[PDB]
Amino acid sequence: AGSLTQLLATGSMDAALTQNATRTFWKSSYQKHSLFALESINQPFTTQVQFGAESHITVNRQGDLLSWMYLKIVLPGLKVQNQADTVQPTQQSFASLDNDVAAQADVSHVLPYIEGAYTEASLNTKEQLIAEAKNSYEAAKYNAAPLPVAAQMQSTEMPDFDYAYWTEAIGFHLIKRAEFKVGGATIDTIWSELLFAMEELMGRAGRRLTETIGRTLRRPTELMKASRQEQILYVPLPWYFTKHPSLAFPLVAATYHNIQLWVQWAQLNSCIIKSRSNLVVLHAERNVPISDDHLRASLECTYVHLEAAERDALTANAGTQLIVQHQAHLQQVSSNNVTARLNFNFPVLEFYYFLRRKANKDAGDHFNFSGIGGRDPVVSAELLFNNTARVTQKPAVWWRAVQALQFHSSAPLTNIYSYSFSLSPEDPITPSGSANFSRLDSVELALTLQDDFGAAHDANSELFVFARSYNILKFTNGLAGL
Template identity: 20%
Template sequence: MGGGLMQLVAYGAQDIYLTGNPQITFFKVVYRRHTNFSMETIRQTLNGTSTSVITGNATCTISRNGDLVHKVYVVADSSTANNGSALVYEVELEIGGQRIDRHYQEWNEVWNELSTDESKALALKSMQCEVGTGGSGAVETVQIPLNFWFCRNPGLALPLIALQYHEVKIKFTWGNAGASLNPEVWCDYIYLDTDERRRFAQVSHEYLIEQLQKETYTSTAGDKKLNFNHPVKELVWVNDTGGAEGVKYQLKLNGHDRFAEQTKEYFMLRQPFDHHTAVPKQNLPVSAQIGLSNNTISNLTALSDGAEMTPKDAAGASSNEITVAGGTALKVETAVFDDISVGDTLVLVISALDASNDAFLPTASRAVGDVFFAGVSAKSGTQDITLSTKFTKLGSANTQLDTIDVGTGGQGRCFLHKVSNTSQSEARTSKLSKEINVYSFALKPEEHQPSGTCNFSRIDNAQLKVTGSDGGGRIYAVNYNVLRIMSGMGGLAYSN
């Protein structure tokens, strides 16, 4: 009997819980037929400021070209824009003159960072002209997706066919994208077949939608009041300057602790890891090897060559030697100095040896490929670097360097790398460089299906306790509400 058949007949009482009375098979595909529809992208008319400038405003009345409206993009042609996501500083949705939702540049950057899969992160950043711009790449069109509820889920597409008596308007406040742009608005329309179109036009609709609320808080420690309403599924707060080490947060509801006080890493790393598609890149401390000049690697050169990296002046140093004064002091070019941070590790790699002019002294245990390292403990002036220890050979703590000898014109004998353990400077999907903190009441806050909320309308006193200074910033709350559409008009079921 073959092994496959042996597995098949090895069937016991426990297997009844797995395969007894089967309801599906993996070997016969099942599908469901859908209603007939089509889609088309159509440009909208903008009224107001047509060029993006600070405080410039424009209004777009969604035309009735199709039955439903789904995705909305802001588009602008430019080869010089370098921060496209800043084009939409603020955007507001109105139905029948009532504001339904309002989003901000910062929130769009935060949401994209949390919800964009890694496979699409660089593409989104490219679409917003934040990489490969200035004529150096092929991306010359800014394309910014809006993140209203109907833009993210086709099942929530806004039924224009049922809003015969109410106009849908999108109001923009333009920002500075690094260039003067002429923005356009493009909408994806959905066309329904006759029967479904008739049903959408005649019956009333109730949509469970998502809204955004915002509070600004100061940098001082203490309790920050949260004036939010409606069932909230998650809180997200953004620091302006980044919190200091040891900052802690705690949520209080009507004087009761919602959870034990936690360090900021719980909200920056653990919560996004548990509840979102991605952990924000700028929250992650990473080890990154990068060069100290415009090239990937900086060469060490002799004093007489105007070295990219030279030591402090030391008595008795010849033109063929680079002496590290006391073994822990270096002097570097200003351009290199700016690339080095306290806490970084400098790594020296021997790339060549010369019998008459060895690359390193002392001569013990030296060989091509040997690696020596030292930490950076302090910086001063514009060139002076203090090392925490002498350059020490990897794997041999007893072998340390006092003198580096690369010979006259010795370019290429030794290479210098930097290994840093600091946070990324900007996000995966934008140029946002602020810490993102998350606390989710929902199991899966990115999904439309509710999986947990806290009804802030029933909370008299909600506070976020901050221990330590985190730079201040803004707190966002994502809440549910109900949009009712009947008799050709639409409005919210619950107000603030």
Template identity: 20%
Template sequence: MPGGLIQLSAYGSENQYINGNPQITFFKSVYKRYTNFSLENIEVPLSGPDELAWDMPIKLKTKIPRNADLISNMYLRLDLPPIFSTEEMNFAWSKDLGFVLIDYVDLYIGGQKIQRLTGNFANIQFQLEHSQEKQHAIKRLIGGDSFLSYDAVYPGGYPGFNSTNEYQDSSGKTIKNKFFQTAPAIFKRALFIPLDFWFTKDPGLSLPLIALQYHDIEIEIQLRSVRELYTVLEVDKTYYYYGSNKHYNSGSGMESIVHRRNGNPNGWNGIMPIKDVDIRSFTTYRRVKPDVMKKSHHISNFVRGSYDSKTWSLNPVLDIKYVFLDECERKKFAQTSHQYLIQQVNKISFDGNVGNTNHLLELYHPVKEIIFETHRDDNIERNEWSNTSNYQYNTGYDIYEYQTSYWFDAIENENKSIGRFNPLSDENTPTIDDRFQEFIFRYGPHGESCDPSCPLGFNINSELLTLEQIMHFKDIWKFEKAAYIPKIDSLNYEQYHTHCINGGFIKFNGNYRQQERVVEYWDSVQAYQYHTSIPNEGIYSYSFSLFPEKFQPSGACNMSRLKNVEFNIEYKIPPLNNSEIRYGNRKYKWMYNTDFFVVNYNILNLTGGMGGLVFGN
């Protein structure tokens, strides 16, 4: 008897709960017939400037033309120019450029604002609601590829980098390349930025143009200025030290030289009996927002090779998916009233927060989720718009760049290993930042680049050292480029923790709605329970819904019936401002800004050829 028949015969009363009165079979496929339709993506031009402004936002507008019966997915399409950048002035687009570019997008029906999208909430939503594979695809759409923003930070060159300074044109003629490259550093491309209005979430939510005969649908977009979209490499600090052009033995008995700064790099006090001593230097760099007063920072230098005050042609359009219905369904949509459950996002911002801070939120409507992000208020200096960590740069640690143009002779240590030396601070930086106590270098003999697994330890202090106390290495060496990170220890660990907050709690009308929880609860536990992915550090959420990503409501809190909603957050304590000019006249070097994004339900009513919201604030 076959074993399968034995299993079938093993049937008892327990089977009644799973096999009794069966409703489906797995061995006969069933399908449903659907109404006839077709889809077409059509580009809709936007009125307004064709170029981004250098130091102010621009607005683009359009009325959605009635090219078909419904609209579904919508994208903002923009062109990026080719970028020509050299090692001396490295260029990098801001991370997640497409989302950063958008300040906001408003949708109006009959003159009433129905929904507002913001670039930073789109970035948050993209991280929470999509798998890692889908996020990779979206990054391709929005210009979130690493080579747009990171290759100018790490050594290795741009996608179009070539070390030769000549190239051949189409006729075979050798041409001097003024950019020292045979191709753009970053190639031109088109961005397709998803505009996730409620009707793009599901085909069943498509917005029926055919039911809005008397009301227009309008889109208004505000884009950031060019200055907010990229960074340039700028000198941070320069340090000076003494070196020798001749080989010598560190223990040969040469007279020591005391290094003291007096006025400028070439004017030092002290005994200088050794004739071949000269002054060396190394310089640290940092990525900064372009300076409006520096023509060399202007985008035109990287697009066309020289300053001309212009930016580039955006060619902005909306790419909209239109839906065409057959005649029968068209009549039904046109003659029937429709009520759509939609989601709105209300943004509430609180700036300049430190320590234990209570935020009073004025909320309305059934709210299914509260999402909030925190970031350092000095991120604006580096165009770090998507950086929600407690670090200066959106890389998981602080990055500074190092480069020196000096060659020098040196000798090995007695144990044939690379030695250490200590730089002096200059007159503009009398003390060296204590955080940066260790460098990691890429280096090699005769200026060759070397595998990063061969690091050179480099200690910093402000001590004045003698020449014999400075140890050199063999033959001619050149430091190419390096990044250095803050040394984190028990004394400054809290200051450089990834998160900007320690935790928080929620109160409704003075009573605890959510008891105090540590930062990992808001950051990871909530995302794990209610979302597809866990986002970057600094993005937090609290859900009143079982399944907040789904259209079907599964829980909400009616905030219109609550008088007092408080969200208390304990922020980190930043380092004190030690009266340094660059930080301005304030107590801390930086503080924290928080944006709350409150996701609520509302009803869009379409009747008699017109549309409007059922509930207002």
């Protein structure tokens, strides 16, 4: 009686929701689709792959569309030997944990707050004086309550043996820059720092790229274990056509253009960290000093094979694809107040920004976007259009956590900040907002950074700003162009 009465208890308001219902929950409807197949094919680079060099590949035409694209990287296992035991000790310098430049830079900021005879003190007494000076510095700069000295003395249990390892997220770090080219024109460009920021914000829970890029979430002991043997990494290249099947790049519609991936590789000296400064780093299998020719890479492409009728239709009329392109503003930081002039073009969906200390970069911690003592490097930021506040001054947590909560699949674990003009900037096919930067005379991101950011040992810290913008790729008569 009650359940039937609920179906009868309808009024004029229910008519807007349920009158002439076009859907039922109790019967499945499905759509028929055209026939297609997927094939994954690995392809060698057209030029030699080496650390610090640029390499390119011309993408083969082994199907009708191009869907997924992965850079397959093979890194050798690492071993170490004392320089005294080596017949040829001359190698490039690597970052070493016995010379922690990041810890030395952090100590340099607290030196003015050390009370007593620091120079003559025992090692254990120096560690105590540094921890007390950190409390005095943080009280003076941040009105922070002092932490117990014992809580600041975190011994990272480092192993009592010699090692070397590939840096955190080495699969991204290796790709300093990649360019997707069609007919000799650059269609899009991605950077190592952008790839990491995109994975932090858009990386879905349970599908994080951890193993696929050599990322351990800053657990040095896991990087050491992984680096003792050969590593095979599959780094996704997040081009517009890899984001949705309807955006797959129509190879058949671009028949008269070569499709190329160009990759600028990281220098070998930046890719490795060692336990001690006096160690030589060896290729674990070959027992020779590690060299720039030990980088191996290939391109793994997923091709789509279409039925003849769909292939012929796509060849006759591929039309236009909405694309997202990436733009970059890279700036050196030497002061706590920084203004970035964002000379980006087109309808910008969103931008990302973050800072890297010089000391973190020099320590080989390339994706450590933290400030001094691991703090947030940004105090506040403001966004100006034509000297008018588009976003008034907001604290770092608003740009990092509130923007990520509103617009992104994930909140960043590092100090990555974002701002979206789009309601859904991760939707590759549905435009949901933008600001046209080609119609603004000035776009300025004004930053107030933490105290002493870009001073002394951190002179030439880096500001990264990346923007995502809409453009249109047009296919006509076997040619493709922006």
